Amino acid sequence: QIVLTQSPAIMSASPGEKVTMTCSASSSVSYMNWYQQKSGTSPKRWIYDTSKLASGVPAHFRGSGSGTSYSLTISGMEAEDAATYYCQQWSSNPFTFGSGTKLEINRADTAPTVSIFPPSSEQLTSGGASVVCFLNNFYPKDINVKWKIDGSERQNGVLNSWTDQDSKDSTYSMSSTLTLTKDEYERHNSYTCEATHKTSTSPIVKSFNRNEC
Amino acid sequence: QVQLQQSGAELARPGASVKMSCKASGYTFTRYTMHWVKQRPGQGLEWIGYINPSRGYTNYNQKFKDKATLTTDKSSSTAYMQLSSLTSEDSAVYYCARYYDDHYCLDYWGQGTTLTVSSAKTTAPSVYPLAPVCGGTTGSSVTLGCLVKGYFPEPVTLTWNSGSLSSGVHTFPAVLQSDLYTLSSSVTVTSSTWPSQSITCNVAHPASSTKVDKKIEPR
Amino acid sequence: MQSIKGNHLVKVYDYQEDGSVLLTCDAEAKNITWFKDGKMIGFLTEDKKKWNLGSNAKDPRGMYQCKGSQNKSKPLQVYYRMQTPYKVSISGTTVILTCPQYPGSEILWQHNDKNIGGDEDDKNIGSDEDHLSLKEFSELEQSGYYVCYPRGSKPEDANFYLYLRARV
């Protein structure tokens, strides 16, 4: 019944900045809770009873509000504060959650380290061939990968997967796999992975010619 | 010292039913209500309902009435949640959590149980070692990889050298293309560490009882 | 019970030499206006501030609330036996309380800021839906403030507390 509208839905802050996220209840509630969730793990009780910090929660966090308006503040954004925060109330039944605010940590731009991997000898035995390309530790998240076989771009048969912001350097990494049939793979010689990132106008190129060493 | 241990991942077919558990310890089990929360892939949190272990009192979010059924077993300090008439809408991660009245919140959470609702068969993954391109550069460090392709359902567990090697590791989220998942992982170490020392990719997919260790050998 | 937060400004003065029941108002010291079941029963201009209900022997009962310079305080339902209110029933030595607002949600209770009716380990204190049963009621031990509230909410947000005093 009680709808909790969180804003902003997504945001990013540079280290040291003061971050403010809000939760607006459709009806008055006597208190608001906030849970923190980081990728791949369970939500964690963060702020309870509107302004009390759970044990272990950095003291630069603050919760406040009343009636229909509550907020969570981070005075001095730190890399480890990046995560998704959900508000929650139970002054009225049913117990409800806000849709969450996803907070990213800003950092200087850094180019990705590119590595290309030919199909393994084992997969080739299986009649399949996958060419993998790792784009590691870059920022911002925006990046493009182009595949080229014998100099021409191949767009189909590609599978891209990004990781979430790293818990150490706050960068992103991407994996791009080009899958072909073994027969296709053997009928061409040049395989190239081209990465385009704002950190540069010219692409980062990694490639190889099959069977050559 | 409060702990909530949830049961393992599960695969069930549409129309079936599943029962997952949450074993509590570190506190008086009957003194606090146990809640269940649902989180669909890339989605937010949703409240299912709760149960009072004392006498079995339960309350549900209207949307989950008759879909979810909560029960507990005092003697074993375990709470259970049964989900019936399953559909793909029920595929998600389910958490169990203790509600601590004095703090008006869910203070401790289980690690969560992932539920996959699908008619697709279980398929064992193929694990391929990813060694750098054949050559002899003198770089100060090298990047190796591991490709886990064509498996269903999630999840798989991937580690390097039995988990000893953790830093410099990136395991990319699996992606679904057909009833098959594909996932990759990269690890970066100093050039003096490999091929000198051995680097092995340990992959596990219990759903198909597969346990593979792929040592990365230079091409 | 002991706290006034949540606008529960009216309290029973627990320190009388004679069996008289005195009510207190925790509001900005100025001019206190007292009410009973909605109607004004007194206006205290400075000097005194406590309201006398008479001897506890005449079973004073009612919804009492006070008011200083601001708005009215929430009521304090007084019930001696020597807006929908709590229902009190006495049968022999058993005292039964019924929660005024029972929307079908889990009803919890507190006596002088302490939960009760939860553990099954007490044969003389039972909770059945919106009803709290007190068997072998002890006058000096179980008289005091009572409040029912739904799981998840703060007791202080209750519309009003019940002050129960009964000789059984």
B/e letters for C104-125, b = 16+ CB within 10 Å, e = fewer, are ebbbbbbbeeeebbbeeeeeeb
Residues of chain B with a following break (C to N over 2.5 Å): none
Smallest Cα distance from A56 to chain B, Å: 13
Residues C66, C142, single domain; the answer is no
8 A C-beta contact, residue C63 and residue C57 = no
Half-sphere exposure of B211 (CA within 13 A, CB side): 3
Contact C105/B at CB under 8 A? yes
The CA-atom distances, in angstroms, between A7 and each of A19, A102, A108, B12, B46 are 12, 10, 25, 37, 18
Strand ranges (E), chain B: 3-6, 10-12, 18-25, 34-39, 46-52, 57-60, 68-73, 78-83, 92-100, 105-109, 113-117, 126-130, 141-151, 157-160, 169-171, 175-176, 181-190, 200-205, 210-215
Q: Do B172 and A213 touch (CB under 8 A)?
A: no
What whole-number distance in Å separates Cα of residue C34 and Cα of residue C53?
11
The reply to whether B1-119 and B120-219 are identical in fold is yes
Q: Do C118 and B54 touch (CB under 8 A)?
A: yes
What's the gap between Cα A15 and its chain centre? 17
Bridge-based pairing of strands C51-55 and C20-25 is: antiparallel
Q: Using CB atoms and an 8 Å cut-off, which of residues 128-157 of chain A contact chain B? A: 130, 132, 134, 136
What whole-number distance in Å separates Cα of residue B69 and Cα of residue B81?
6
Determine how many CB atoms are found less than 10 A away from the CB of residue B173: 15
Query: Hey, what are A165's tokens?
Result: 């912001």
Q: Which of A177, A181, A191, A210 best tests the B interface by mutation, with the highest count of B CBs <10 A?
A: A177
The CA-atom distances, in angstroms, between C124 and each of B154, B172, C93 are 53, 60, 11
Chain B partners of C106 at a C-beta cutoff of 8 Å?
52, 57, 59
For residue B15, list its beta bridge partners: none
Task: List phi, psi (to 5°) of A121.
Answer: -65, -30
What whole-number distance in Å separates Cα of residue B25 and Cα of residue B1?
8
SS3 state of residue C157: helix
The CA-atom distances, in angstroms, between C53 and each of B19, C39, C61, C78, C86 are 60, 15, 9, 10, 20
Domain segments of chain A as ranges: 1-107, 108-210
B/e letters for A12-34, b = 16+ CB within 10 Å, e = fewer, are bbeeeeebbbbbbbeeebbbbbb
Cis peptide before A94 (omega within 30 of 0): yes
What whole-number distance in Å separates Cα of residue A166 and Cα of residue B102?
35
Q: Do A42 and B112 touch (CB under 8 A)?
A: yes
B/e letters for B187-196, b = 16+ CB within 10 Å, e = fewer, are bbbeeeebee
8 A C-beta contact, residue A35 and residue A85 = yes
What whole-number distance in Å separates Cα of residue C111 and Cα of residue C50?
24
Query: Hey, what are A69's tokens?
Result: 């308006």
Residues C5, C67, single domain; the answer is yes
Mark which of C28, C55, C82 sits at the end of a domain: C82
Q: Do B47 and A35 touch (CB under 8 A)?
A: no
Closest CA to A102 of A28, A165, A175, A174: A165
- Compute the radius of gyration of chain A from its Cα atoms: 23
Query: Hey, what are C125's tokens?
Result: 């204190």
- Length of chain C counted residue by residue: 168
Q: Which of C105, C118, C119 sits opposite B59 (nearest CB)?
A: C105
- Length of chain B counted residue by residue: 219
Resolution in angstroms comes to: 2.1
Contact B5/A at CB under 8 A? no
Closest CA to B185 of A175, A139, A179: A175
8 A C-beta contact, residue C31 and residue C44 = yes
Chain B partners of A159 at a C-beta cutoff of 8 Å?
175, 177, 182
Chain B partners of C121 at a C-beta cutoff of 8 Å?
none
Smallest Cα distance from A172 to chain B, Å: 10
Cis peptide before A203 (omega within 30 of 0): no
Which chains does chain B touch, 3 or more C-beta pairs < 8 A? Answer: A, C
Contacts of B187 (CB under 8 A, 6+ apart): B143, B144, B145, B146, B160, B165, B168, B169, B170, B199
Contacts of B11 (CB under 8 A, 6+ apart): B116, B117, B118, B122, B153, B207
Closest CA to A131 of A172, A62, A192: A192
What whole-number distance in Å separates Cα of residue A208 and Cα of residue A116?
8
Q: Indicate the CATH number for domain B120-219.
A: 2.60.40.10
8 A C-beta contact, residue B37 and residue B56 = no
Q: What is the CATH number of the domain that holds C90?
A: 2.60.40.10
Domain segments of chain B as ranges: 1-119, 120-219
What whole-number distance in Å separates Cα of residue A35 and Cα of residue C35?
44
Contact B191/A at CB under 8 A? no
8 A C-beta contact, residue C146 and residue C162 = yes
Q: Which residue of B has its CA nearest to C119?
A: B54
Task: List phi, psi (to 5°) of B30.
Answer: -80, -10
Contacts of C116 (CB under 8 A, 6+ apart): C109, C110, C125, C132
Closest CA to A140 of A201, A198, A203: A198
Third-level CATH fold of A1-107:
Immunoglobulin-like (2.60.40)
Q: Do B173 and A161 touch (CB under 8 A)?
A: yes
Residues C149, C131, single domain; the answer is yes
8 A C-beta contact, residue B97 and residue B35 = yes
CATH class name, domain A108-210: mainly beta
Contact B143/A at CB under 8 A? yes
Which chains does chain A touch, 3 or more C-beta pairs < 8 A? Answer: B, C
Determine how many CB atoms are found less than 10 A away from the CB of residue B58: 16
Q: Which residue has the tokens 């507390």?
A: C161
What's the gap between Cα C64 and its chain centre? 10
CATH class name, domain B1-119: mainly beta
SS3 state of residue B207: helix
- Tally helices (H) and strands (E) across chain A: 2, 19
Q: Do A93 and C154 touch (CB under 8 A)?
A: no
Query: Hey, what are C59's tokens?
Result: 């079973």
Residues C78, C130, single domain; the answer is no
Domain ranges, residue C26: 1-82
- Check the CA dihedral C110-C111-C113-C118 and report its sign: negative
Q: Do A118 and B219 touch (CB under 8 A)?
A: yes
SS3 state of residue C33: strand
- Compute the radius of gyration of chain C from its Cα atoms: 16
What whole-number distance in Å separates Cα of residue A98 and Cα of residue A71?
12
8 A C-beta contact, residue B171 and residue B203 = no
What whole-number distance in Å separates Cα of residue B204 and Cα of residue B155?
9
Contact C103/B at CB under 8 A? no
Query: Hey, what are A208's tokens?
Result: 């190889």
Q: Do A132 and B147 touch (CB under 8 A)?
A: yes
For residue B58, list its beta bridge partners: B51
Q: Do B61 and A94 touch (CB under 8 A)?
A: yes
Q: Which of B5, B62, B93, B106 best tests the A interface by mutation, with the highest count of A CBs <10 A?
A: B106
Bridge-based pairing of strands C161-166 and C114-116 is: unpaired
Bridge-based pairing of strands B141-151 and B57-60 is: unpaired
Q: Which of C106, C152, C154 sits opposite B52 (nearest CB)?
A: C106
Contacts of B28 (CB under 8 A, 6+ apart): none
Q: Which residue of C has its CA nearest to B54?
A: C119
Alpha helices (H) in B154-218, listed in sequence order: none
- Compute the radius of gyration of chain B from its Cα atoms: 21
Half-sphere exposure of A23 (CA within 13 A, CB side): 33
SS3 state of residue B62: helix
What whole-number distance in Å separates Cα of residue A124 and Cα of residue A155?
21
Q: Which residue has the tokens 């340990």?
A: B202
Q: Do C103 and A93 touch (CB under 8 A)?
A: yes
State the count of interchain CB pairs (< 8 A) between A and B: 136
Q: Which residue has the tokens 């709808």?
A: A3
The number of folded domains in chain C is 2
In one-letter notation, the amino acid at residue C35 is F
Contact A161/B at CB under 8 A? yes
